[PDB]
Ligand binder design. Sequence first.
Ligand SMILES: CC[C@H](C)[C@H](NC(C)=O)C(=O)N[C@@H](Cc1ccccc1)[C@H](O)CN(CC(C)C)S(=O)(=O)c1ccc(OC)cc1
Lengths: 99, 99
Amino acid sequence: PQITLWKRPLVTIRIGGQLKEALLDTGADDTVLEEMNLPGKWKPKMIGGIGGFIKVRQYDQIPIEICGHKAIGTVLVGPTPVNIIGRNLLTQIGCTLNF
Amino acid sequence: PQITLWKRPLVTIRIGGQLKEALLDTGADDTVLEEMNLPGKWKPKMIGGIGGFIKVRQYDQIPIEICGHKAIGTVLVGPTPVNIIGRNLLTQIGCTLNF
Ligand SMILES: CC[C@H](C)[C@H](NC(C)=O)C(=O)N[C@@H](Cc1ccccc1)[C@H](O)CN(CC(C)C)S(=O)(=O)c1ccc(OC)cc1
């Protein structure tokens, strides 16, 4: 799709069999989802943004369908203000910025 | 132009006499610039992201050129680690996400 930006670019994602809403975030290096259970091993990680750093759980090689497009990659889980799809997965689904 | 997301989507902006590098950020509602002593009236604001909230100064109707495209609107100024072009200005330069 072509998505304009007069509203937040929120899309439905499917992960671990569940539907969620998530923000397509070109200013995010990584994908960070609100607290949830995901299967498999994870490792502790810290990530930072505008207000400082937070602790997250890093799950590698997780499948996620974003607005109908398949990705499989690293998903961070922790106290993010909103579910965020970052560049690691935006690149996988062929997302570009255009003007 | 088309901008891929393999790397941070940094572009050159002009506001004042300072050319700066800023992120084209679809995850940002508002535009947030690194500390700079802009002239004019402002209002205090708090904005929140990963790690919590920071205090910024809200300046209105500020001309900013983004990649040679003229925009004018609200810019938030404070202790962000990166200059952030938000949706309020991305819409004005006709920027979309595409996949
Ligand atoms: C991967 C971790 C994290 C998500 C990301 N950090 C990095 C290093 O990519 C980030 O915070 N990304 C930021 C941009 C960024 C990048 C690097 C360092 C600091 C910030 C994000 O794109 C915009 N922000 C709003 C979001 C959190 C809903 S925001 O910046 O917090 C924000 C919040 C409110 C705004 O206006 C209301 C505008 C912007």
